[PDB]
Amino acid sequence: SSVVVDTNGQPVSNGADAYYLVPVSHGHAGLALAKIGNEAEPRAVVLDPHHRPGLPVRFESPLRINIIKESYFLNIKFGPSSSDSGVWDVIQQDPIGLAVKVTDTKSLLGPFKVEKEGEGYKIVYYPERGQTGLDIGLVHRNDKYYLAVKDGEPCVFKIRKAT
């Protein structure tokens, strides 16, 4: 139910502003796109030490409210609000399990919530809206840390307005 706040204590906007997800551990790393194997284009979301601050995200709810709360189902996307691309989804991928990947479609209510965890926030994935969700963590495979479902081992982030 709480309002999600950024590193300046301000409410996180619904879509209008972009934010960096800054891990609290895993040293300095930022969000990036990578290949999983031999796909042509990098569409897996990873945390990469070489990309700081990383690709910023927008959090989107179809509710008529200009801020985000922990109770809202969210779409999360890279790029501008206007673009169909960059939308996060959870995809079965043999090496990772359930990987966070970008795609170019978006459901009315997205798969995620942002929930307080430790000193920051985690992303939680909901297979079904009436049931408990599954923590998003990191799967280390082929020299990359892939964002993936890893229940009980969440990646904890602070949310920095991109300005």
Side-chain angles (χ1 to χ4, degrees), residues 1-27 29-140 142 144-163:
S1 304
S2 292
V3 174
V4 176
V5 298
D6 67 23
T7 57
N8 297 310
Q10 292 293 108
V12 168
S13 65
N14 185 2
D17 303 289
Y19 297 84
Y20 302 109
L21 296 178
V22 184
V24 306
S25 313
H26 310 118
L31 296 171
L33 294 174
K35 300 182 175 177
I36 287 173
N38 288 276
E39 323 93 35
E41 301 297 338
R43 290 183 180 157
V45 180
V46 301
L47 278 173
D48 188 338
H50 298 290
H51 285 103
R52 301 153 292 104
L55 295 173
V57 299
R58 292 168 189 278
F59 302 98
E60 300 183 342
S61 166
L63 295 169
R64 196 172 66 127
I65 187 165
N66 65 0
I67 58 72
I68 298 301
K69 299 186 184 185
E70 295 184 45
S71 53
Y72 298 171
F73 290 103
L74 303 175
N75 283 295
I76 300 175
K77 76 186 301 302
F78 295 134
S81 300
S82 66
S83 172
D84 58 329
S85 59
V87 175
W88 292 18
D89 200 19
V90 175
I91 303 301
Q92 186 190 279
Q93 278 268 200
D94 283 333
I96 302 311
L98 293 189
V100 177
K101 302 190 74 187
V102 291
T103 186
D104 54 1
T105 59
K106 180 164 86 178
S107 290
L108 174 69
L109 287 167
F112 304 108
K113 303 192 185 191
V114 170
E115 181 172 348
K116 205 174 299 99
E117 181 68 53
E119 79 197 73
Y121 289 102
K122 60 178 174 180
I123 309 301
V124 181
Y125 164 63
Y126 285 80
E128 193 182 336
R129 295 187 307 265
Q131 303 302 323
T132 315
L134 299 164
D135 297 319
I136 295 299
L138 300 176
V139 169
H140 191 28
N142 301 314
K144 293 282 169 64
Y145 294 90
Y146 291 98
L147 269 66
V149 178
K150 201 173 210 188
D151 204 30
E153 301 182 76
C155 190
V156 177
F157 297 105
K158 297 196 176 186
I159 304 174
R160 167 156 39 107
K161 194 174 175 189
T163 295

